[PDB]
Amino acid sequence: PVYSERGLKKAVKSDMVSMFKAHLIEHSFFLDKAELMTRGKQYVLTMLS
Amino acid sequence: QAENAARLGRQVLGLLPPPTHRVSLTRGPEFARGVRDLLSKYAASTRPTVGSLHEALRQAPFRQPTYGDFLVYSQTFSPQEPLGTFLFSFKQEDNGSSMDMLLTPTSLFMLSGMEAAKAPQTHKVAGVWYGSGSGLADFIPNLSELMDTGEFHTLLTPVGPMVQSVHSTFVTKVTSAMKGVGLARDEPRAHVGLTLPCDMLVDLDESCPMREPAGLNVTIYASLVYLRVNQRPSMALTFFQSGKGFAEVVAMIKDHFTDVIRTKYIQLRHELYINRLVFGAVCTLGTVPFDSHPVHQSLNSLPVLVFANFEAACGPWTVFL
Amino acid sequence: ATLEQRPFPYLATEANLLTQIKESAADGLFKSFQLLLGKDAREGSVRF
Amino acid sequence: HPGFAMTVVRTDEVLAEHILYCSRASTSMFVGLPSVVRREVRSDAVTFEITHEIASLHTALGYSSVIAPAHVAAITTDMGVHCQDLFMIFPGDAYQDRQLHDYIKMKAGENLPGLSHGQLATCEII
Amino acid sequence: EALLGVYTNVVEFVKFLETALAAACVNTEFKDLRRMIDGKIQFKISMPT
Amino acid sequence: ALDKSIVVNLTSRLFADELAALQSKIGSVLPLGDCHRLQNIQALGLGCVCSRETSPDYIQIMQYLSKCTLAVLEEVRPDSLRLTRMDPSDNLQIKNVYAPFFQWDSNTQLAVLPPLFSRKDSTIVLESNGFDIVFPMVVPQQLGHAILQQLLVYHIYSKISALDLYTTNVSFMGRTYRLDVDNTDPRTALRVLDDLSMYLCILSALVPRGCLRLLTALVRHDRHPLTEVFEGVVPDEVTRIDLDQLSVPDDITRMRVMFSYLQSLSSIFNLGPRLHVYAYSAETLAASCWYSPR
Amino acid sequence: FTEYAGAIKTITSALQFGMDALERGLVDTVLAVKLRHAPPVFILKTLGD
Amino acid sequence: NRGLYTLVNEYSARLAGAPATSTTDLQYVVVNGTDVFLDQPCHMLQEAY
Amino acid sequence: PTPVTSDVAYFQTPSNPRGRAACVVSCDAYSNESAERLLYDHSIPDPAY
């Protein structure tokens, strides 16, 4: 609720759609991205919590 | 059976005007104890309850309307109305003892003869409550001549919203409301608000803002405009809603009827009749409180606004131009 | 399935229901709601 | 390239969550009694009013509370390369020929119905 | 057709004195604060050399 | 019953300078924006429409003044201003500290006007808060009209100039005064004059001929105390119109429309709200009056 | 009776609303005083030494 | 220009001159100071990054 | 088909092959006439560039 405490204006939805794109690319197939990370269990657990 | 008459002992004696505050001087300063409604700041506690503030809710101001009892032919007042319409009392001559003539704003739309597209919605609705328009004009044979010299606005006294209509076959009994909020008959403890069609009402405060002060008051005005269409005289009745004060609205109305004034006075470069110079008039139909939302409704469709907390305070007709 | 404002004996819950109601009801999270302001927020009357 | 060069100034806005620390007993608080005021009595409703008054005094002389930027949440400013239109700020000043002034204003420039990357941000030119 | 559940929020109050925010303050009840014009607290600091 | 009180919270402690002038005018009438108990100081002044850097227009200021609710001061605490309210239709104590002083009595009539004589006298600026406060003026209606009579005449003869002793002086029994015009926006004060051009030439079209013949019989020999405007010489126009013969039923239809257009001139010469004083104390300068909007 | 006693439940819950929205006024205005007297770290740290 | 102890007190309590709007389409200047919580560290330091 | 002078840096960032962005979640709700100006009006620059 930190994003929509102002109400979904026109400048909030654009800030919120730009995070739909950035989370779909960076954190997706996380159990496959974490086979090649150094951290591993630290990445999956903060993804799954 | 006296239990049914004991209910009238409660409800009549409980519902009376408050008495005059008269205490003899020999009793002492007991008269200060009889002043309860002037006290306005009540004590609050950590957890107040209704048992703490039942005395604060008991003092209420003394509000009461004054009703008008009208006995109308059932041909003019249509047998089905939305129970909050505004009323007018046309008066030409005392012919009989008690037969009175009342004009709803859709009824005065038919006596006018104004065109269809200038009020495109109520022309369908006022064409089905009434005939061609000559079912009412047979009462006033002077509608061709009351419009020429301009005596029609001097024969309307605005009355206020409906309260109750007891309808019979030939005669309809109509009870209106003056001075304030009329008490509703069929629903108990309710209040009849005033209903205007969305078509006649012309809102007046409207801004982008692109700042105007708030207040307590906004006043509904009536207007009645003498004009000519198809080389025949006809009137036009519009409503206004603004709390701007009377010095502005007369200038605000003239900007609304600019094109209507322009089309008429082209004609009197050729013939000047002094009776034709009078143009319009403006009445004050009573105040609405601030920030009440006019609630849209729909009846058969006919979109009809409604104003809660309306109180009626009639004024004269002042001739603007 | 119709909404109605009849004076039911509403039951009380432990969980809060207030998180993001201002912009979820306004953007249509759920169909068939009605907002009541001020003196309208009351259990009105019974009529059978 | 015209004869001069130019520098450009923006702004930026960051939604940040903050940590506020406050030491103990740093303000003395005074709490009065609430009262109930009845007013704006109408025919549909009667409005009330519950009021309350507070005195707050700072107990000690040193600074006793410290706020800090802790966690970036979003960037709102979009860091856009939109430039500020001086035609909007100064509408009175114009050229002598009103046929040429309506020409240059044609070659430069509520018009935006939606924006994709973020809230647009104006730049200047020095 | 059936009513299956008639549910309603209850807002539990949170007193100021039972928040831990009140640890950073000193709370005194003062019956007639509307009577007061101005408060005042005076310091005397001696400094040795 | 009902309550009326407005306590104005304020974000900085006032200086002893500006607290001394407010304490001098403890009974005063000033409008404010919204109808609530708690209120910012940026609604209290009349200076939201009448500022220094903006050229004020006294018609639009007066046009602003019939919209607002009006308030009376009770106390000036060093933090918060405390004000009481004026509502229809309520009896209330009123006290004039208004600096261009006039004398009232019991059963007098009043009205509220913008400051038109000395604005620097009638406005105190608040240096601590940055927002200045403008006090309006309360005037009895005989001088309430006569100032608005002169201000409409002034904008007529300022436009012809595109001098002052005839246009900026408001006359009254015993005293003469100066209107305050240095930077006035005439555009709202001329739309009123545009509508006077509408009424006045229609009044010239339906002039009764018997009433013009009454002046051709009067001002030549019959000299009266209130006809000294014409100075004993007939106007050239009045001799031109009375060539026709007089007939009674022509002027009956004329004088009714003469009558009905004089109903309309109230709408263009309105004051703001009105104040019907029923009792006024002389040595205490308080009064008692009931507020009537419109 | 069930119209009466359902109308006293409305007017209490409208007046429990008044006090329990005024306990929020303490917690807001106490926190608002603290934020007016809270200069940031980067200013106050080098004054601390 | 004044001493820096006065500038620390004024930094948190006084929203400084010419701020910007938030949440709205373009960069407007906010005159309604009832809500806006911004803290701008670009006046005291007098820089631009 | 595309003009031979289109930019290569358009084909690295993930946007649509129209040349103009088509995000309609950003604009106002139920305004069909205003969402047509994003897609096809060329009085304005596209919301990507």
Side-chain angles (χ1 to χ4, degrees):
Chain A
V2 67
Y3 295 99
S4 67
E5 66 183 2
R6 302 296 184 186
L8 295 180
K9 298 296 190 291
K10 186 170 74 171
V12 174
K13 293 178 183 178
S14 300
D15 198 9
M16 188 176 289
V17 168
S18 293
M19 293 178 181
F20 296 166
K21 299 176 187 291
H23 192 278
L24 192 147
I25 295 170
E26 185 175 2
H27 307 97
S28 294
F29 302 99
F30 61 92
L31 195 143
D32 201 8
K33 304 289 180 66
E35 295 292 328
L36 296 173
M37 287 183 181
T38 307
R39 297 292 93 193
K41 294 181 181 179
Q42 188 173 0
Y43 180 74
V44 178
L45 192 64
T46 62
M47 186 66 67
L48 201 145
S49 175
Chain B
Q1 64 181 356
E3 296 292 326
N4 202 3
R7 293 185 191 272
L8 273 70
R10 299 290 188 272
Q11 290 181 356
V12 169
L13 274 73
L15 187 63
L16 288 172
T20 61
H21 192 191
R22 184 178 295 113
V23 174
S24 60
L25 189 145
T26 63
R27 187 177 291 175
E30 190 67 28
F31 64 95
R33 290 183 177 92
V35 184
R36 299 293 181 90
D37 55 352
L38 273 70
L39 194 147
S40 177
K41 293 179 183 178
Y42 294 95
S45 69
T46 304
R47 187 180 295 113
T49 326
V50 177
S52 66
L53 294 179
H54 64 279
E55 192 270 330
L57 294 162
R58 185 172 180 83
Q59 302 298 317
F62 180 75
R63 296 291 184 269
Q64 181 173 359
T66 59
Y67 294 143
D69 289 329
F70 292 146
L71 197 141
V72 187
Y73 294 98
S74 67
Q75 189 178 4
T76 80
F77 190 77
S78 67
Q80 294 180 351
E81 288 291 332
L83 198 62
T85 58
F86 191 77
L87 273 65
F88 293 97
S89 292
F90 185 75
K91 180 68 196 297
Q92 184 64 256
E93 184 179 358
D94 278 326
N95 195 6
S97 69
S98 174
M99 298 307 301
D100 201 2
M101 196 183 299
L102 270 61
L103 296 173
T104 63
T106 62
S107 300
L108 189 58
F109 181 78
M110 294 302 291
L111 272 75
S112 67
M114 69 182 83
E115 293 295 328
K118 301 299 189 292
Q121 184 67 45
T122 65
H123 194 202
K124 184 175 178 180
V125 176
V128 81
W129 296 120
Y130 298 101
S132 65
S134 65
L136 293 174
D138 48 356
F139 282 140
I140 311 102
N142 292 319
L143 282 177
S144 65
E145 294 183 355
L146 286 175
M147 293 300 301
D148 289 335
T149 58
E151 288 182 352
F152 187 76
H153 72 280
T154 67
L155 299 179
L156 295 180
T157 62
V159 177
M162 269 164 69
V163 171
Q164 189 183 6
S165 289
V166 176
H167 180 75
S168 298
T169 307
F170 294 101
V171 158
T172 304
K173 176 70 170 65
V174 175
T175 299
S176 63
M178 303 175 188
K179 273 191 181 178
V181 186
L183 188 66
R185 293 287 186 272
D186 296 330
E187 291 181 354
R189 303 291 186 269
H191 292 280
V192 174
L194 171 136
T195 70
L196 298 178
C198 297
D199 199 0
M200 298 295 172
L201 188 144
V202 175
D203 197 5
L204 198 59
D205 48 351
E206 180 67 32
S207 297
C208 293
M210 190 70 203
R211 181 181 172 183
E212 292 178 352
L216 187 60
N217 193 358
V218 50
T219 62
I220 294 173
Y221 292 153
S223 67
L224 196 146
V225 171
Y226 294 151
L227 57 91
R228 290 180 69 189
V229 64
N230 293 316
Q231 296 179 359
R232 293 177 67 188
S234 73
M235 74 188 76
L237 175 137
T238 56
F239 285 144
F240 294 108
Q241 181 186 3
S242 69
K244 293 185 180 71
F246 185 73
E248 311 186 10
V249 182
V250 180
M252 292 298 291
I253 285 171
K254 293 175 186 176
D255 291 335
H256 189 201
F257 294 108
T258 299
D259 292 332
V260 179
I261 293 167
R262 290 176 67 89
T263 57
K264 180 189 282 187
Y265 289 153
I266 288 170
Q267 300 297 110
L268 56 79
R269 179 63 180 86
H270 291 82
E271 70 276 14
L272 188 143
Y273 295 99
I274 305 165
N275 290 320
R276 299 294 190 273
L277 268 71
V278 53
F279 182 73
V282 165
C283 177
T284 302
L285 304 185
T287 66
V288 179
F290 189 71
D291 80 14
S292 67
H293 294 167
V295 178
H296 291 81
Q297 295 295 322
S298 295
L299 294 170
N300 51 357
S301 295
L302 182 64
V304 174
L305 293 175
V306 61
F307 291 99
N309 280 317
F310 182 79
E311 60 182 357
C314 182
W317 295 92
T318 57
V319 178
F320 74 102
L321 177 52
Chain C
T2 54
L3 191 150
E4 57 184 0
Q5 292 90 14
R6 295 186 181 275
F8 294 110
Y10 291 91
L11 275 77
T13 61
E14 177 68 30
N16 54 350
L17 301 174
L18 291 166
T19 61
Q20 290 179 354
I21 303 300
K22 184 70 176 297
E23 66 265 7
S24 302
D27 287 334
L29 175 61
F30 47 86
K31 301 300 294 296
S32 69
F33 67 99
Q34 186 172 0
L35 194 151
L36 300 174
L37 287 172
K39 83 283 293 177
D40 290 330
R42 64 182 179 91
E43 291 177 351
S45 65
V46 51
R47 185 176 299 272
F48 62 96
Chain D
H1 186 198
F4 60 94
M6 40 182 263
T7 62
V8 168
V9 184
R10 282 174 175 169
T11 48
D12 187 66
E13 291 178 354
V14 173
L15 284 175
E17 295 177 351
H18 283 267
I19 297 174
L20 173 67
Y21 179 75
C22 297
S23 69
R24 190 185 68 193
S26 60
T27 55
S28 65
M29 299 305 296
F30 294 96
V31 171
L33 288 174
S35 65
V36 168
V37 175
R38 64 187 301 274
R39 62 183 190 175
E40 293 178 354
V41 178
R42 294 177 187 175
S43 300
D44 289 331
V46 173
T47 67
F48 280 162
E49 178 77 27
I50 300 176
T51 50
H52 194 190
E53 294 187 358
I54 297 170
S56 67
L57 198 154
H58 193 192
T59 305
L61 53 91
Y63 294 97
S64 64
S65 64
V66 167
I67 201 169
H71 184 272
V72 54
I75 302 166
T76 319
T77 322
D78 201 10
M79 299 175 186
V81 218
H82 187 202
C83 81
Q84 193 178 7
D85 296 335
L86 284 177
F87 289 144
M88 296 177 182
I89 291 96
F90 289 154
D93 292 324
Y95 285 152
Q96 187 179 4
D97 284 337
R98 298 291 294 161
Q99 191 181 5
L100 187 146
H101 184 271
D102 293 331
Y103 175 72
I104 287 172
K105 194 178 179 183
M106 185 68 204
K107 296 293 184 182
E110 190 174 3
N111 285 321
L112 55 93
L115 41 89
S116 67
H117 284 91
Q119 166 186 354
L120 196 62
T122 68
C123 299
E124 272 88 1
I125 292 97
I126 296 171
Chain E
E1 60 182 357
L3 281 164
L4 295 174
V6 183
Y7 292 140
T8 283
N9 192 12
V10 165
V11 176
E12 291 182 354
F13 64 97
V14 179
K15 298 294 292 180
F16 172 68
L17 191 59
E18 292 178 353
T19 58
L21 201 153
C25 293
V26 169
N27 294 316
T28 60
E29 197 268 337
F30 183 64
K31 289 284 181 66
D32 47 357
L33 196 145
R34 60 183 182 88
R35 302 290 178 90
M36 183 183 284
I37 301 298
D38 286 325
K40 187 188 287 179
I41 276 178
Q42 188 65 44
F43 289 100
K44 185 177 185 292
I45 300 168
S46 66
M47 185 175 288
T49 59
Chain F
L2 191 66
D3 191 78
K4 51 183 188 292
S5 68
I6 298 168
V7 49
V8 181
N9 198 0
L10 181 53
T11 188
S12 66
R13 187 178 295 273
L14 295 178
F15 293 159
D17 194 7
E18 55 194 1
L19 193 148
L22 292 171
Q23 186 61 254
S24 181
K25 292 183 180 179
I26 193 65
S28 176
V29 174
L30 56 90
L32 43 78
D34 297 331
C35 298
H36 293 281
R37 183 171 179 171
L38 275 73
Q39 190 66 255
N40 290 321
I41 199 166
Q42 295 176 356
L44 265 68
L46 190 144
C48 67
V49 72
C50 181
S51 297
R52 289 176 177 175
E53 62 186 2
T54 63
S55 295
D57 42 355
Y58 295 114
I59 295 298
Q60 182 67 45
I61 295 167
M62 185 177 174
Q63 186 172 2
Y64 178 82
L65 191 144
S66 66
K67 292 179 180 177
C68 290
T69 184
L70 275 69
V72 182
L73 276 80
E74 296 178 354
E75 294 180 354
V76 181
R77 290 181 180 176
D79 295 331
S80 66
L81 289 174
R82 188 175 181 180
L83 283 75
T84 190
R85 183 183 168 85
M86 299 171 71
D87 285 332
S89 169
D90 190 74
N91 292 311
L92 58 97
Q93 296 177 0
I94 192 167
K95 185 177 179 181
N96 39 358
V97 212
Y98 295 92
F101 182 75
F102 296 107
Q103 185 69 41
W104 301 348
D105 53 347
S106 64
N107 295 319
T108 189
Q109 190 65 41
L110 294 180
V112 182
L113 288 179
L116 288 163
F117 294 99
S118 296
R119 293 176 63 195
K120 188 178 180 181
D121 196 5
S122 177
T123 66
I124 54 170
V125 60
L126 270 70
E127 296 178 354
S128 179
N129 296 113
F131 181 77
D132 51 350
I133 296 169
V134 175
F135 291 157
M137 184 180 175
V138 301
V139 182
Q141 284 189 357
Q142 185 64 40
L143 286 167
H145 292 171
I147 297 166
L148 185 144
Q149 304 306 102
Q150 191 58 254
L151 192 146
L152 292 177
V153 171
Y154 178 75
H155 287 284
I156 290 171
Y157 287 95
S158 70
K159 186 68 184 297
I160 302 172
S161 68
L163 300 177
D164 292 328
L165 292 175
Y166 289 157
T167 61
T168 57
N169 284 319
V170 175
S171 67
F172 182 66
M173 296 296 107
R175 297 291 181 90
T176 58
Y177 293 106
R178 178 76 178 178
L179 294 177
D180 194 5
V181 173
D182 51 355
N183 292 319
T184 56
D185 194 5
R187 62 181 181 178
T188 57
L190 198 147
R191 183 178 291 173
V192 175
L193 288 170
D194 282 332
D195 294 332
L196 278 172
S197 66
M198 291 172 68
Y199 291 116
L200 192 60
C201 280
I202 301 175
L203 286 175
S204 67
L206 49 92
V207 177
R209 306 295 180 89
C211 189
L212 290 178
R213 191 182 292 272
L214 189 142
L215 285 188
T216 61
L218 191 145
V219 303
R220 296 178 70 91
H221 68 286
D222 281 322
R223 292 192 297 114
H224 294 92
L226 61 91
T227 186
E228 294 179 354
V229 182
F230 293 100
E231 294 290 328
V233 179
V234 292
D236 187 73
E237 191 188 10
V238 186
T239 65
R240 298 290 183 185
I241 308 299
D242 287 332
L243 57 88
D244 289 328
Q245 294 180 358
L246 298 179
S247 68
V248 180
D250 283 328
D251 285 333
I252 296 299
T253 64
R254 290 179 181 175
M255 288 297 287
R256 291 182 65 252
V257 186
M258 176 65 75
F259 181 82
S260 65
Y261 281 153
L262 268 64
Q263 298 184 358
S264 64
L265 295 174
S266 69
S267 71
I268 201 166
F269 290 117
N270 269 317
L271 296 174
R274 293 178 177 177
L275 289 179
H276 297 280
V277 175
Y278 61 91
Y280 174 76
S281 295
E283 64 185 2
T284 319
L285 293 176
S288 64
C289 169
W290 61 283
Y291 179 70
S292 68
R294 299 177 67 252
Chain G
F1 290 105
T2 188
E3 180 67 31
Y4 176 78
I8 200 167
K9 288 167 69 178
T10 293
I11 191 164
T12 53
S13 69
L15 187 144
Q16 298 290 323
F17 175 79
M19 298 299 291
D20 293 335
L22 185 140
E23 296 295 328
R24 314 297 190 96
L26 284 168
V27 180
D28 194 11
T29 53
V30 178
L31 177 61
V33 170
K34 297 293 183 181
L35 292 178
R36 290 177 184 173
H37 296 288
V41 170
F42 64 92
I43 290 173
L44 192 146
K45 180 181 179 291
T46 64
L47 273 64
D49 287 329
Chain H
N1 198 11
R2 300 176 295 174
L4 66 91
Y5 284 151
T6 60
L7 297 175
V8 176
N9 289 320
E10 194 179 3
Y11 182 80
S12 61
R14 297 289 178 87
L15 188 143
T21 51
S22 303
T23 323
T24 59
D25 305 337
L26 299 175
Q27 293 289 104
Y28 297 104
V29 48
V30 53
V31 67
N32 193 2
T34 59
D35 183 76
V36 178
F37 291 120
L38 56 84
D39 290 332
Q40 44 181 355
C42 288
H43 303 193
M44 187 70 203
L45 299 177
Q46 202 69 248
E47 283 173 343
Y49 293 138
Chain I
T2 301
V4 207
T5 57
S6 62
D7 285 332
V8 173
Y10 183 81
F11 295 96
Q12 184 67 45
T13 62
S15 62
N16 57 350
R18 290 182 64 245
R20 289 183 64 90
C23 291
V24 183
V25 187
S26 302
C27 71
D28 289 333
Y30 292 94
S31 70
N32 196 3
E33 293 290 327
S34 177
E36 189 179 3
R37 290 173 61 89
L38 288 173
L39 297 177
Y40 295 117
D41 196 2
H42 288 80
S43 177
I44 56 167
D46 53 342
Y49 293 90

